[PDB]
Write a protein that binds this ligand. Sequence first.
Ligand SMILES: *C/C=C(\C)c1ccc(-c2ccc(N(C)C)s2)cc1
Length: 133
Amino acid sequence: TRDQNGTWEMESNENFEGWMKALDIDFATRKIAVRLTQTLVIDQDGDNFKVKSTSTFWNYDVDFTVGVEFDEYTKSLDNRHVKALVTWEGDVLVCVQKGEKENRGWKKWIEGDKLYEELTCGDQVCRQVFKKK
Ligand SMILES: *C/C=C(\C)c1ccc(-c2ccc(N(C)C)s2)cc1
């Protein structure tokens, strides 16, 4: 299924610190952030998405249309400019963020009642699993 609508509550988080380190996020932010449970809110209508990543420590929102490239500032994550594009590879939603960092982006897919996510940067991969609330 390509339907990722929902409020998604984290159940598993692996190598989140490695991904943050690959983005050069400062020590203090990384050490706090690695401890925290996350929520992902996805509002999807056709090709149009609004996505929110939240914890007690951050609230990062992005809107995009599948297949439409967009320039973005990564704001309170790492304050970089990238050229972003979200597409479907089968039923995997794939974001590539072109810019200073190689292999930068994310992937999301549904396995049952769960959303699986990869966050990638450089040679680091963070793997997460969320349950639908
Ligand atoms: C589909 C997933 C998206 C668009 C996403 C996931 C995770 C984040 C963030 C993780 C840490 C953040 N800070 C601001 C510390 S954001 C953003 C976007």
